[PDB]
Design a protein around this ligand. Structure first.
Ligand SMILES: CCCCCCCCCCCCCCCCCC(=O)OC[C@H](COP(=O)([O-])OCC(O)COP(=O)([O-])OC[C@@H](COC(=O)CCCCCCCCCCCCCCCCC)OC(=O)CCCCCCCCCCCCCCCCC)OC(=O)CCCCCCCCCCCCCCCCC
Ligand SMILES: CCCCCCCCCCCCCCCCCC(=O)OC[C@H](COP(=O)(O)OCCN)OC(=O)CCCCCCCCCCCCCCCCC
Ligand SMILES: NC(=O)C1=CN([C@@H]2O[C@H](COP(=O)(O)OP(=O)(O)OC[C@H]3O[C@@H](n4cnc5c(N)ncnc54)[C@H](OP(=O)(O)O)[C@@H]3O)[C@@H](O)[C@H]2O)C=CC1
Ligand code: SF4
Ligand code: SF4
Ligand code: SF4
Ligand code: SF4
Ligand SMILES: [K+]
Ligand SMILES: [Zn+2]
Lengths: 45, 376, 292, 145, 206, 95, 112, 94, 176, 114, 125
């Protein structure tokens, strides 16, 4: 009968990621300081 | 100067916080492997290599198999070569996970060890499925590999590979930009390019310092010349850059594994030369020649033409090689094992000059020391 | 000799000494040394024990694989004694307590139990029997400990006439209740070293002329109890218990010239001065005057 | 030789001959080299061994039932290149790679035949001749063996 | 031919040519140069040439063997000089390897190569420990692998596989003690060599 | 075919048993002597002789590649049966 | 001028051309003290002169590196220093002299 | 896979990743633990003719070392100088 | 081909300098690390409920040794000693003689399970599938002596486990 | 008969190194007995040192003497720097090895060894 | 510089071998006899050195063969008898040397199987 052994599927496997993926999150430094200082000024008031 | 006193005995001289001298005392795991190998046939000596760098089992097997195949003047069949590169890179993932996360755990960051050791457990399943052992597979042998992959294994390697880069990302989120991690590793254990060469360093200990060298590129073996991948290079030669190189090498290993899965060819898995590789069991039980050769390979073993070879691979920890001397019989005359960690640990004293006691832990971690191979 | 018990090897751990010994009381002070010397030369040792197996663990490394065998036993159960001795060529009795308990008085540990071991050993055909008595054993002693030792010493000699009876003085050593006893706080004492007593016991097993004899194991020097206790405090670097125990410590060590001693078994007695620091070093946080 | 077979047929099978209590015969293993026949006729001076039949069915033996009992008979075990003739006392007890060889002398007579004493794990397993051209050239007597 | 390792004649010639190159430049020390059929270049030198030959191979512009891959020894008792000292070097510039071999006996020191390669430090300690070869002018020659106080050099062919002493804990002295080795099962020596010659190409003239 | 000795110790299929004076049987006191009760010598004897119609038969022990190396057994003698050297099955040429 | 050599410990050279001319000239000066018919002198002069010619005949550093095939120009300078250091040692060792001693007869025979 | 929608959103937002696409735990996508039997191929020496061992015997083609000089012109290097590596175009810099 | 892991020049524009200042003072990257461990808190753990649940294994698994029989009950082992010869640890000790019925059988078959490296070479070398490494891995003992297997113990293991062993051999023999 | 020396060029120079080593060992014994808390006397420690030197008294090869001193210095370094533990120091005294018989009859009784 | 040393080469004091296993042993230097079960002569080319056989006893637990001889398995190989003798000398082992046994040349002749008047005529083939 026909040879049968472990092989990849016809057409191969789907693509595999490997590259580093660390997405960008958060606000700029300006906004972060603005929120912090705004919180301080509300607290003082 | 206050003097303090696998497993390691470090004798250190400290002036306050600074290490003034570091004298490693090893041999606590010396088991006379090289002498034992002289009383074994070439096949009988193979399992010893699983137990050297016992985190990179099939890479040690590959190094020994390549050395014997060189003296035998034979070559393994192409499918065996692709399997060997496939499991060589899976083994590099096993080592780099162990190296990075235990390096992290030793300095307080204990959580990545747990996430990544669930991945190690799934790779242990790939070893167990091809060889029946989770670690000391004795799978890669002179002539090729012991058995063909079971049906459905490659599909499961694809499934594991498809998700792994996300696990690396989670590891990087915990360490790469962490100011505490950087404080423990940046500018720690700086080694110059010329010092690294003269001290006999290899692998990431070289590339962390900018030296552009990787045996898989410069002196390729098996089918490494047929796969594409990049060599990560450091710029500062410190612990942080060697950490980044190891993380990037894991990513490139997944890149290579992807090509191995797609380019796996059909055919036999061990050299079709029954004077070297044993015949199939069905042949052994029907053919007179096959039974004779099975009988002789499993008692006397194959004779290896007299000669000597130094053979090296790019193991996960660095250049791993054997100087294998054949006297013409079926037992090796001498087997010297070149462990990359031997030279690396010999340079701990040089690397730790001007550093503090807690940095010595980081420097030992960045060298990636397993005392199975250091002591042999 | 049955083929299984012909000696072989060079007298090491993997050798075959040809001795098959049942050691009653092996989990005590003297027992741990006796079992060690038996297992050193590759003897088969049967260890009947009354205590938890956890408390016999220190004996396991003393012999090669299979050489130390453990059994349950009860001092009052003769069937459990028969199980332990019916394959042995020598039986050693080290059973004893320095105090009495609600369940076992001195007449039990030193008369009833030794007599039962001796009787069952006689019935089972055991060739050799070694029984530990005491130098100061005496039916008129003020100590109920020493009176029982005399009664039992006589019953063993009657029950198993060929028994080798050994009468040690106070034994000192790392786990003793002698030097340690003073360190934890009229009379002349002649204490003997634990290793000397052990070697005497081992050489009695081998010596055929030791059968049917009674030995007194004593140290090389005699000391006044006051001078000894003074020396203990000096060695322990320290500024210088039941009623029955106090009587024993104040009983002068008998001088029995007619009995053979350690020199009749090829054993040189170890002076206290050589070994005292070994025992007393852990107690730290001028040799004693000897009677001529 | 080559490392594989291309023989696709069925194999010959031959019945066994009883030639005494010393030499076991499994004659399907015989390769028809005729060493035993020549040794028996030339060295032992006994013409009881020969070939019967012809072609592929040619068989080595005595034709009739007969014991090959000679003071030198045990030597046909050594010269037979295959396991067709084997030592009956030695059967199944050891493999060659595991025995230790002690070169020694025979004392069963006054010829002083040179021998090898095969031992394993402290036990004597068999006796083999040791070549000494001026004594026993490479033979021993059945008593020595 | 699928099962036979292919030859590489280009590398064989290059290494042969460099072998002559080295031997022309250092005739004072080079005794033999050979290239194996799998293309490894071996320089055999007089032991006096260790420092000059290694320094030349490290520093010369057509050599630049900057990396000491390994340094080991082989014990061959039949030789007058039983110990063969083997240096395996790597040249990154020329992507090439070379092996340098010399010899010594029990009583003849070899010059330490720590001045050429700092990597040699521990390798020479290992050769001292396992083979008993003394290296002169070593910054710190002492055992590295064996237990403290260990007697003998285990990797010598005449050192027994299981050694002479074995350890155990002894309760009487309350410490680990060393005693002459006895084995419950002796190691079973196997005689595996076939009495028929395997490789005619290596037959030694009689 | 397990039997006990006069001491009551079971004899193994290899004929092993400690004799009366052997101290080594103390190892079994309070425990047991491991003995396999399925004696192969008796189990093979229970198999019937196979009647075949040729001078030579082959045996591979059954199961093809899961048995033993295939051997050919000569059945020329009517005095006894042909026995497989590997598995012990017996064969007889019919009439 | 490049920002870094890429190799830890190997600093950039501001004037590589003049540094190499000084070193190659120094090497040729030292090689003059070696006997004319020593292979080390003949070969080392040959390669040194080949590199010196390329240095004088190419003013652009990266074009020069492509011709020297020695990696970064700072690596070529270091290699020149290594050769100069070796040449001085060769004068003391005098390896051009005959073989000091023959080996024993079977010293290099393998297998035994 | 059994996490509620809210918990999936929570741990996705906390990690910054779509964790549900690449779960660490394996479910039905793995290979069945029972597979059809294989039928493995045979090597190139499985021939009935033109297959004499002396034509495919690697061990017997090994030779003793070639002796280029024994104790019985342009300069050369052991090999041509190694070529400069090229920067990756997949991702030159992390 | 190579890539640089850490060769980047931080931007010095004021917007970027302030971004790094906010990270230094507000600990933003430390907060990001907290999110990752938080996301794991709400992930399903990978733990299995041993001994009620078991880690998956393959038919090739190398566990406790056993000696097998033919379907008739005859031992498969013929005392060929190939297993003993190949054993890398010399863990196998065999003695043999003709059985009462003349069969070639062992009288001793010991495996020192504390010498064995569980490599499976013995079952590769066996020509009759007599010695196998079975699927059992839960046979830890309280004494060293209990791990010194003799033939009776190994035959009992074969009778105990044959049902599973045969099915595992059935699933993998076409790869051998 | 020309050979490469180790350190000494003749037995007179070799003997000077021996005496320096003996002096170093002799002076170190009191410290060793104290630091390692040995149960031997200083006299016993020095008697052992003298015994070890004496068994090598017959050597006439300066190279062999050189190696004996080299090994003696390494042994002293391990002791002085406390690389050895108490077990290593006490291995010179064979405290658990029962004396082997020496006369012919005693060796005849116990076994076959000469 | 080279010094002059005239004493016999002796390394017994620096090899670490215990005294009992130098002075009481007896090394045998010989060429192994051909295994008479086979015609191959390749195992008769080199000289060997083995030591005197010493006691093996049955282990009480398993019946395994125990030993206390550390040299029981030690077998060295030498190219010549002189090399083997030299190695034994410097190690202090007393030894016996057995001269190599060579099979002497035979006079073989197929035609003698059919002699007209001599006894070499064979009665069968
Ligand atoms: C505060 C309660 C929040 C909560 O637990 O909801 C869980 C619920 C399910 O979370 P999940 O991660 O998707 O669980 C996976 C399956 O959905 C979970 O689905 P499942 O199929 O596994 O459901 C069955 C399971 C589901 O478990 C439950 O029934 C939840 C019971 C928690 C009680 C609080 O039932 C159990 O096993 C009951 C075991 C009880 C465990 C002990 C809980 C007692 C805690 C109180 C201690 C006081 C004494 O989470 C939410 O709905 C988020 C909103 C809750 C606010 C946060
Ligand atoms: C109108 C004008 C009003 C005037 C007032 C205006 C004031 C507002 C502006 C001030 C804002 C300052 C913020 C103060 C917080 C402390 C900042 C700080 O100290 O950070 C620096 C410190 C070290 O940073 P480093 O990277 O090592 O470099 C600096 C040295 N070269 O970094 C660190 O401390 C790292 C800490 C390491 C420990 C990490 C573990 C904690 C991580 C999670 C913490 C979550 C926060 C907890 C919240 C409190 C809960 C109650
Ligand atoms: N040590 C000395 O100074 C001297 C001692 N002797 C005698 O030497 C022998 C041993 O001395 P030593 O070893 O110091 O005594 P220990 O008390 O140290 O050990 C006594 C042993 O007897 C066993 N034992 C006690 N009572 C019983 C019981 N009722 N049933 C069963 N077993 C029991 C104990 O077992 P468990 O652990 O289960 O309690 C223990 O193993 C004793 O007979 C003692 O009288 C004689 C002269 C001097
Ligand atoms: S010697 Fe053996 S193989 Fe040759 S003919 Fe006689 S029985 Fe057959
Ligand atoms: S060992 Fe030799 S004689 Fe016996 S079956 Fe195999 S090839 Fe035939
Ligand atoms: S598994 Fe390996 S080590 Fe264990 S008995 Fe089998 S061959 Fe020997
Ligand atoms: S188990 Fe198999 S390999 Fe081992 S002796 Fe028995 S038949 Fe031979
Ligand atoms: K034969
Ligand atoms: Zn069959």
């Amino acid at each position: 009968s026909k040879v049968k052994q472990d092989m990849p599927p016809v057409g191969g496997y789907g693509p595999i990621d490997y590259k580093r993926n660390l997405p960008r999150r958060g606000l700029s430094g300006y906004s972060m300081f603005a929120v912090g200082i705004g919180a301080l000024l509300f607290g003082y008031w | 100067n206050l003097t303090l006193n696998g497993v390691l005995r470090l004798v250190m001289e400290l002036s306050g916080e600074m290490v003034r001298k570091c004298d490693p005392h090893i041999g606590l795991l010396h088991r006379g492997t090289e002498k034992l190998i002289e009383y074994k046939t070439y096949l009988q000596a193979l399992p010893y290599f699983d137990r050297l760098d016992y985190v990179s089992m099939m890479c040690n097997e590959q190094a020994y198999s390549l050395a014997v195949e060189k003296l035998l003047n034979i070559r393994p069949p192409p499918r065996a070569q692709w399997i060997r590169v496939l499991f060589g890179e899976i083994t590099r993932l096993l080592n780099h996970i162990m190296a990075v996360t235990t390096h992290a755990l030793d300095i307080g960051a204990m959580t990545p060890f747990f996430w990544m050791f669930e991945e190690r457990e799934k790779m242990f399943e790939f070893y167990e499925r091809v060889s029946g052992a989770r670690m000391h597979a004795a799978y890669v042998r002179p002539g090729g590999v012991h058995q063909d992959l079971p049906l459905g294994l490659m599909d499961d390697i694809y499934e594991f590979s498809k998700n792994f880069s996300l696990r690396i990302d989670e590891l990087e989120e915990m360490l790469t930009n962490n100011r505490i991690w950087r404080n423990r590793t940046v500018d720690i254990g700086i080694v110059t390019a010329e010092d690294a060469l003269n001290y006999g360093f290899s692998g990431v200990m070289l590339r962390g310092s900018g030296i552009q060298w990787d045996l898989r590129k410069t002196q390729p073996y098996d089918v490494y010349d047929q796969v594409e991948f990049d060599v990560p290079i450091g710029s500062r030669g410190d612990c942080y850059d060697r950490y980044l190189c190891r993380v990037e090498e894991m990513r490139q290993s997944i890149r290579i594994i992807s090509q191995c899965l797609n380019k796996m060819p059909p055919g036999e898995i061990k050299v079709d030369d029954a004077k070297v590789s044993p015949p199939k069991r069905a042949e052994m039980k029907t053919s007179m020649e096959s039974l004779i050769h099975h009988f002789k390979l499993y008692t006397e073993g194959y004779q290896v033409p007299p000669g000597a070879t130094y053979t090296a691979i790019e193991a996960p920890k660095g250049e791993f090689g054997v100087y294998l001397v054949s006297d013409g019989s079926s037992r090796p005359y001498r087997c010297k094992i070149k462990a990359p960690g031997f030279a690396h640990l010999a340079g701990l004293d040089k690397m730790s000059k001007g550093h503090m006691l807690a940095d010595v832990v980081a420097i030992i971690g960045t060298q990636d020391i397993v005392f199975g191979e250091v002591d042999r | 000799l049955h083929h299984a018990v012909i000696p072989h090897g060079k007298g090491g751990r993997s050798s075959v000494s040809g001795i098959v010994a049942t050691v009653f009381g092996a989990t005590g002070f003297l027992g741990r040394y006796v079992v060690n010397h038996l297992g050193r030369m590759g003897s088969q040792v049967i260890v009947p024990h009354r205590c938890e197996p956890y408390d016999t663990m220190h004996l396991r490394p003393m012999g090669d694989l299979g050489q130390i065998i453990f059994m349950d036993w009860n001092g009052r159960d003769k069937d459990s004694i028969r199980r332990a001795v019916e394959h042995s060529s020598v039986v050693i009795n080290l059973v004893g307590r320095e105090w009495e308990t609600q369940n076992f008085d001195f007449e039990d540990v030193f008369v009833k139990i030794p007599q039962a071991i001796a009787q069952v050993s006689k019935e089972a055909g055991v060739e050799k029997f070694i029984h530990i008595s005491h130098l100061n054993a005496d039916i008129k002693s003020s100590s109920k400990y020493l009176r029982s030792k005399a009664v039992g010493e006589k019953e063993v000699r009657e029950t198993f006439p060929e028994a080798t009876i050994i009468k040690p003085a106070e034994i000192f050593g790392r786990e003793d209740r002698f030097l340690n006893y003073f360190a934890n706080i009229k009379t002349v004492k002649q204490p003997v070293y634990i290793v000397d007593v052990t070697k005497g016991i081992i050489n009695a097993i081998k010596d055929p002329d030791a059968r049917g004899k009674t030995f007194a194991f004593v140290g090389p020097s005699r000391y006044l109890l006051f001078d000894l206790v003074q020396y203990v405090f000096a060695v322990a670097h320290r500024p210088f218990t039941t009623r029955d125990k106090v009587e024993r410590i104040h009983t002068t060590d008998k001088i029995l010239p007619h009995l053979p001693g350690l020199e009749d078994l090829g054993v040189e007695a170890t002076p206290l001065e050589l070994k005292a620091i070994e025992v007393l070093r852990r107690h730290r946080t001028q040799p004693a005057k000897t009677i001529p | 030789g080559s490392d594989r077979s291309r023989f696709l047929e069925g194999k010959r099978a031959v019945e066994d001959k009883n030639i005494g209590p010393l030499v076991k015969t499994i004659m399907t293993r015989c390769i028809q080299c005729t060493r035993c026949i020549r040794f028996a006729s030339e060295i032992a001076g006994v013409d009881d061994l020969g070939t019967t039949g012809r072609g592929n069915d040619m068989q080595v033996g005595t034709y009739i039932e007969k014991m090959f009992m000679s003071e030198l008979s045990g030597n046909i075990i050594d010269i037979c290149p295959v396991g067709a003739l084997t030592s009956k006392p030695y059967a199944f007890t050891a493999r060659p790679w595991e025995t230790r060889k002690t070169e020694s002398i025979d004392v069963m007579d006054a010829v002083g035949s040179n021998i090898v004493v095969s031992t394993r794990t402290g036990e004597v397993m068999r006796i083999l001749p040791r070549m000494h051209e001026d004594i026993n050239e490479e033979w021993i007597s059945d008593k020595t063996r | 031919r699928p099962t036979v390792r292919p030859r590489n004649d280009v590398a064989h010639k290059q290494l042969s040519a460099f072998g002559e190159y080295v031997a022309e430049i250092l005739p004072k020390y080079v005794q033999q140069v050979q290239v194996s059929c799998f293309n490894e270049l071996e320089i055999c030198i007089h032991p006096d040439g260790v420092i000059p030959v290694l320094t030349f191979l490290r520093d010369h512009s057509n050599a630049q063997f900057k990396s000491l891959a390994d340094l080991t020894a082989v014990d061959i008792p039949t030789r007058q000089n039983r110990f063969e000292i083997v240096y395996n070097l790597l040249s990154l510039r020329f992507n090439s390897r070379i092996r340098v071999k010399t010899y010594t006996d029990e009583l003849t020191p070899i010059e330490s190569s720590v001045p050429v390669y700092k990597a040699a430090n521990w390798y020479e300690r290992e050769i001292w420990d396992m083979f008993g070869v003394f290296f002169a002018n070593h910054p710190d020659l002492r055992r590295i692998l064996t237990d403290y106080g260990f007697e003998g050099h285990p990797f010598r062919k005449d050192f027994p596989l299981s050694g002479y002493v074995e350890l155990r804990y002894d309760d009487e002295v309350k410490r680990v003690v060393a005693e002459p080795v006895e084995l419950a099962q002796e190691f079973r020596k196997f005689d595996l060599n076939s009495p028929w010659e395997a490789f005619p190409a290596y037959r030694q003239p009689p | 075919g397990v039997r006990t000795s006069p001491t009551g110790e079971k004899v193994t299929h290899t004929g092993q048993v400690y004799d009366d004076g052997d101290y080594r049987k103390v190892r079994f006191v309070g425990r047991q002597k491991e003995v396999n009760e399925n004696f192969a010598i008796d189990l093979i004897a229970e198999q019937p002789v196979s009647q075949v119609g040729s001078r030579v038969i082959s045996c591979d022990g059954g199961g093809g590649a899961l048995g033993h190396p295939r051997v050919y057994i000569n059945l020329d003698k009517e005095t006894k049966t042909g026995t497989c050297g590997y598995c012990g099955l017996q064969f007889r040429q019919q009439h | 001028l490049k920002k870094t050599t890429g190799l830890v410990g190997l600093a950039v050279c501001e004037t590589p051309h003049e540094r190499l001319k000084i070193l190659y000239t120094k090497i040729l000066d030292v090689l003059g003290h070696i006997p004319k018919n020593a292979a080390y002198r003949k070969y080392t002069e040959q390669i040194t002169n080949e590199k010196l010619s390329m240095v004088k005949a190419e003013p652009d550093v990266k074009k020069l590196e492509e011709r020297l095939q020695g990696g970064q120009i700072e690596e070529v300078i270091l290699q020149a220093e290594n050769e100069l250091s070796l040449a001085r040692k060769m004068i003391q060792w005098k390896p051009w002299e005959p073989l000091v001693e023959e080996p024993p007869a079977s010293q290099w025979k393998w297998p035994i | 896979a059994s996490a509620t929608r809210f918990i999936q959103w929570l741990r996705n937002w906390a990690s910054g990743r779509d964790l549900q696409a690449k779960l660490q735990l394996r479910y039905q996508e793995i290979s069945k633990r029972t597979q059809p039997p294989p039928k493995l191929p045979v090597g190139p020496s499985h021939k009935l003719s033109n297959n004499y061992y002396c034509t495919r015997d690697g061990r017997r083609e090994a030779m003793p070392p070639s002796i280029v000089m024994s104790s019985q012109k342009k300069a050369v290097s052991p090999a041509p100088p190694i070529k400069r590596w090229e920067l990756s175009q997949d991702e030159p810099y992390l | 081909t190579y890539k640089y892991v850490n060769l980047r020049e931080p931007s010095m524009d004021m917007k970027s300098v302030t971004d790094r200042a906010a990270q230094t003072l507000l600990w933003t990257e430390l907060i990001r690390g907290l999110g990752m461990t938080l996301s794991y808190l709400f992930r399903e753990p990978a733990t299995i409920n041993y001994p009620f649940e078991k880690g998956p294994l393959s038919p090739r698994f190398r566990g406790e040794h056993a000696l097998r029989r033919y379907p008739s009950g005859e031992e498969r082992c013929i005392a060929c000693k190939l297993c003993e010869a190949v054993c890398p640890a010399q863990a196998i000790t065999i003695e043999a003689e003709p059985r009462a019925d003349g069969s070639r059988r062992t009288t001793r078959y010991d495996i020192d399970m504390t010498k064995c490296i569980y490599c499976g070479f013995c079952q590769e070398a066996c020509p009759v599938d007599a010695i196998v490494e079975g699927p059992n891995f839960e046979f830890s003992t309280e004494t060293h002596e209990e791990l010194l297997y003799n033939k009776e113990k190994l035959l009992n293991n074969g009778d105990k486990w044959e049902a599973e062993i045969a099915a595992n051999i059935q699933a993998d023999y076409l790869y051998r | 008969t020309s050979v490469k020396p180790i350190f000494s060029r003749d037995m007179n120079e070799a003997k000077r190194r021996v005496r320096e080593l003996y002096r170093a060992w002799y002076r170190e014994v009191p410290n060793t007995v104290h630091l390692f808390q040995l149960d031997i006397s200083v006299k016993q420690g020095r008697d052992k040192v003298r015994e070890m030197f004496k068994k090598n008294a017959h050597i006439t090869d300066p190279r062999v003497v050189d190696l004996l001193v080299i090994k003696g210095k390494m042994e002293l370094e391990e002791t002085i720097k406390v690389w050895k533990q108490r077990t290593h120091v006490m291995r010179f005294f064979h405290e658990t090895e029962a004396p082997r018989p020496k006369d012919f009859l005693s060796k005849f009784y116990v076994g076959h060894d000469p | 510089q080279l010094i002059t040393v005239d004493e016999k080469l002796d390394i017994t004091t620096i090899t670490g071998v215990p005294e009992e296993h130098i002075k009481t042993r007896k090394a045998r230097i010989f060429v192994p006899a051909r295994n008479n079960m086979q015609s191959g002569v390749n195992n008769t080319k080199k000289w060997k050195m083995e030591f005197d056989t010493r006691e093996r006893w049955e282990n009480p637990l398993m019946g395994w063969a125990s030993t206390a001889d550390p040299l029981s398995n030690l077998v060295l190989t030498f190219s010549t008898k002189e090399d083997a003798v030299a190695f034994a000398e410097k190690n202090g082992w007393s030894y016996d040397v057995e001269e190599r046994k060579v099979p002497k040349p035979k006079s073989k002749s197929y035609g003698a199987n059919f002699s007209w008047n001599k006894r070499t005529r064979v009665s069968t083939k």
